Symmetry: C2
Subunit: 197 residues, 2 copies
């Protein structure tokens, strides 16, 4: 079991969190952004790529759901169909509304005006959702889920994204404090990621 | 009760209308060409949106909810590896084929860029056509969500300005069988019927 992973990449970070939550020690092969063995199993050369015996999977969502189904404990999705769909919809909304901004900010080719606006929008949006972190210990959940596995890599990166949340976002800042301290999250961090804070 | 706000012209809504028909779930189809009940439950106002006593959108979210909520017939494999393979195929169809469909249909695309996207999609589909000789559904013995994503694109080849070459016979044969199937026929809006 191996995972080709960009140690700087929030999408690779998602899969490293899932692996850590499941207690699965994969061989983590660090690939800098942009090797033959990876292109051999995944002609797209995208990261992360999971290889399980001779099975290659890519797309962080595909890989996270495979790991959640293959290694059932602890479950990272709800049990019933509506709640599961709600979790998958929340992952889609995080991708659409937050990850798009992250990707624009971090792309060296983004024009500065666009980078600045992306930062402003992402800061405002995270501040706006903060009240939802007051009453449940995980994001809209009583248990760590794949939703948190998508959120945490973004929140870890706020300093590198140039975003400081305001004091009124305390519920979200408290969620960060609890979540970043958890064993599985600490285990997920690449060397590059640890150096971001 | 169960309703689906649907764009009768759009291939992402067509995906969900295929799944609803396959599952026989008696859903109310509400055609949209911004109803307040829709904006009430989905502030993005995107289509398709499924609503029940539940509010879901994004075609992949909606399709997997339907497959989990209404088990028969199963539209995904049972075991994790095969399920991951199906999910990855859906992603590749989205990235490589749906991206081209969307580019061709976007009113902002340069006509020369539409011609190029038509070529790229035609060639890619032709390159994969031999895999349709090996199994009666796309890399599967049974209709699946992979087919539900592919059939709306294939139904639209004429309106996309794409004619497959005779070399693509197994894919053409797949289209013949699939378009005649009861559920796919039930999925078609009037607007989609006008497309052929």
């Amino acid at each position: 079991l191996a995972c080709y992973s960009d140690p700087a990449d929030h999408y690779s970070h998602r899969v490293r969190i899932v692996l850590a939550e499941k207690g699965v020690s994969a061989e983590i092969i660090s690939v800098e952004a942009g090797p033959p063995k990876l292109i051999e199993v995944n002609p797209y050369g995208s990261l992360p790529t999971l290889v399980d015996r001779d099975l290659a999977l890519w797309e962080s969502t595909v890989v996270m759901e495979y790991l959640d189904e293959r290694y059932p404990h602890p479950p990272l999705l709800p049990v019933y169909p509506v709640a599961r769909a709600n979790s998958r919809l929340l992952i889609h909304r995080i991708q659409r509304d937050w990850c798009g901004q992250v990707d624009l900010i971090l792309d060296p080719r983004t024009k500065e005006a666009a980078r600045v606006q992306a930062r402003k929008e992402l800061r405002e949006s995270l501040t706006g959702v903060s009240p939802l972190f007051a009453d449940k210990p995980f994001f809209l959940s009583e248990e760590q889920s794949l939703v948190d596995c998508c959120l945490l890599p973004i929140l870890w990166r706020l300093p590198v994204l140039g975003i400081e949340l305001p004091r009124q976002a305390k519920p979200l800042l408290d969620y960060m404090e609890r979540q970043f301290a958890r064993e599985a999250f600490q285990a997920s961090l690449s060397g590059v990621e640890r150096d971001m804070r």
